[model samples]
Structure formats: structure tokens, C-alpha cells
Target: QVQLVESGGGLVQAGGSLRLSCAASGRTFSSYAMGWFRQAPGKERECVAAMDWSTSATYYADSVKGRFTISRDNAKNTVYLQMNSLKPEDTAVYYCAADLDYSDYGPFPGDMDYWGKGTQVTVSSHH
Candidate 1:
């Protein structure tokens, strides 16, 4: 099975944005739909955004009114998502998931097939 282990800097200064990359390992980037999820210190999990390389237009949940972005680099086989306006409350683990199929109901069983272990980031430091 293919796996994803995302690695990126975790320091962000107040009022600055950060770009985290979920660099997929052992799988083709174009073969799946990228999904982004956010989990704060002790909050429940929620979908922030999702995208497909072929479509390129990200479908973001309403909760993400601002301060979040999702994009991918086909050449690098990596999916990137960013959040702005660093706030203490914005600190959490941002995860990446990939879907191998799409349907009227959404991607594979809601568009999540493989998920990256997730990367924890803090809005107090910058890379």
C-alpha cells in the first residue's frame, strides 16, 4: 500500500501564513483527490477543503470562510494547503488525504482513501 508522510516547518509568527506539504510517498499524485482536515488542541475533526489534480478547483467546506488554502503540485507529487492570520487557536494538526475514486456522493466513501500521518503546526513561530 502507498503511504504519505508529510514533513514541513512548524513555526509561524503572528499575522503570517504557512504552507504545509503532504508529500506522498509510493503513489502517483495524479491518481487521487487531495483532502485537508483540521483538528485543534481538543476540538472535533472537520473537513477544511478538498481538490483533484484534474479539476484543480478546490471544494471547501463552509467552515473555511477564510484563513485556509489547498493546492497541489503535480510535478512534485505533493499536495499543499495553507492557512493565514496565525492565531493561537489555529494551532493544530493539518492532515492530507487522497481519494482514488469519485461519485455523486463525493470521492471514495466521501473522498478519503489514504491519509498522511498529519503535521502539527503552531502560529507562534515561522519557518
Candidate 2:
């Protein structure tokens, strides 16, 4: 089965920043684009960004345009999500994802196919 593992960035203070990692397995990491997603309590999963490995390009949601960055490590089969200006509203489970091509749910680059277990990040209003 395809596998995705995610970790780090469990807590942050308001107005601070943090980073998270997502590792891919059971597939060629560089062959497909990767994305970052987030789910806040009682809210739908939101797409953060989609990153292109071969081209080093990214498409992002307007809300996170300048505050979030997505990148990858080809040699280690890992993707990274970095965010700044943390807020209580930013608390959520962040997921790493990839496209599902040639499947009934796929051919959509902006949509996620497989997802990581997600890293829960809590932003506290105070230290």
C-alpha cells in the first residue's frame, strides 16, 4: 500500500512560526506533485498549496500566499510545510498529499489522492 508519514510542529505561540515534514513512500516522490492541507475543528479540509518537484513551482491559497511555503527533498522522499504568523485560528491537523492519477478520483492536480496521518499543531495565545 502507498504510504505517507508526517510529523513535527505540534505547538506554537501566537505570532510565532513553525515547520512540519511529510515523507512519501511506495511511490516515486519526484514523479508527482505534492500538496499540503489543513483541517480545523468542525471545518472542511483546506488546500494549502501544491508544489511541483521537477519545476520548483507552487500554487497557493490566497489566504496563505505570503505566510506559507511548500517544498520537497527529492533524495529523502519528503515534503516540507513552513508557516509563519501563527494564530489560534491556525490550529489544525496538517496533512501532506499527492495527486491520484489514472484513478476514478483523479487527474486533478490540485486535489489530493493519498494523505499522511497529519501533524496536529496548536497555536496558543500565550507562551
Q: What residue runs in model 2 are displaced by over 4 Å at the alpha carbon?
A: 100-111
How well is each residue in 1-127 modelled by candidate 1, as lDDT tens digits? 6887666638778788887788887867696778777688668766777776566666765655487778888788887777777777667788878876532112223646787888887777445
Over 1-118, each residue of candidate 2 has an lDDT whose tens digit, in order, gives: 7888888779889989888888888977677778888889899787777776456667776777888888888899888888888888889998888873312121233446788888
Which pairs clash (backbone N, Cα, C closer than 3 Å) in model 2? none
- TM-score for candidate 2: 0.85
**lDDT for position 45 in model 1:** 64
Per-candidate Cα lDDT values, in order, are 0.71, 0.78
Q: Tell me the TM-score of each prediction against the true structure.
A: 0.78, 0.85
Root-mean-square deviation per candidate? 3.9, 3.5
Worst 10 residues of 2 by lDDT: 100-109
RMSD of 1: 3.9
